[PDB]
């Protein structure tokens, strides 16, 4: 651990006040749980939903697929919380989500994907990012998934879902990278400067 964190300095959000049923039931996110793990097709749907929630449906590739966590989940030796934490502490998650972003945008993405709610304000990104800066995103992921808010909202057997009417999905608004220059890409104005390898009616 180390020093205590700063103040949370809350803000008014729908999740903070949710005594009343949401407006639309079909827009309520599916609360996937342990009883989904017993079937086979249900287990596949749960695994897909976990990858969509954490990896965001574009990182669902056969190369990004965590085989061992899926096997452990199939056995029942693994809690859903532990499956989520293992997806967080994975080489794909780091290499695709942590690396493009600063600590702060990574914190925002992690709040939206593990806790299901957008940050209260920038000072929350600031207060959370020091856990990364000082202990690694591994300890940050453990801090989120073992935190009080995660234990209250989802628990050990529920898969995180966005605590928002879902008519405004999180993955659409937040890509894994935003407004950075990529070393493997090329600026939009630039043109390819290399072999053409063919002449198709230019």
């Amino acid at each position: 651990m180390g020093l205590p964190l700063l103040d949370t300095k809350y803000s008014s959000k729908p999740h903070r006040v949710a005594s009343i049923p949401a407006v639309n039931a079909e827009d309520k996110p599916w609360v996937l749980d342990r009883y989904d793990l017993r079937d086979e097709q249900g287990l596949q749907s749960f695994i897909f939903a976990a990858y969509r929630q954490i990896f965001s449906e574009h990182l669902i590739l056969e190369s990004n697929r965590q085989t061992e966590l899926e096997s452990q989940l199939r056995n029942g030796k693994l809690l859903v919380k532990d499956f989520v934490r293992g997806l967080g502490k994975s080489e794909v998650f780091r290499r695709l989500v942590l690396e493009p972003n600063t600590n702060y945008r990574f914190v925002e993405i992690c709040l939206k994907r593990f806790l299901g709610r957008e940050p209260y304000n920038k000072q929350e990104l600031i207060k959370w990012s020091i856990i990364i800066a000082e202990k690694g995103y591994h300890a940050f992921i453990d801090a989120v998934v073992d935190g009080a808010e995660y234990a209250e909202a989802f628990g050990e057997d529920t898969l995180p879902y966005q605590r928002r009417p879902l008519s405004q999905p999180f993955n659409l608004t937040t890509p894994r990278l935003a407004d950075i220059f990529q070393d493997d890409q090329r600026s939009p104005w630039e043109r390819y400067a290399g072999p053409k390898f063919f002449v198709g009616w230019k």
Partner: protein, 69 residues
Amino acid sequence: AITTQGKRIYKITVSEAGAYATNKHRTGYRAPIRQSNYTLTVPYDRFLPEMIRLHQSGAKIVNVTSVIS
């Protein structure tokens, strides 16, 4: 988990006897109620916090075994 700590995982048997049921009824059920007994496996590094969590939840543990050594 590379070190000797991450090895020697421990299986834990938890019973949700009436003490746990009273706490869950007063606080409320955020998830559907499950069966009484389950064997739950933990590494050494998360052993102590997990018994803290179970004891706080009021559940009484039945059995603990060392999967490794």
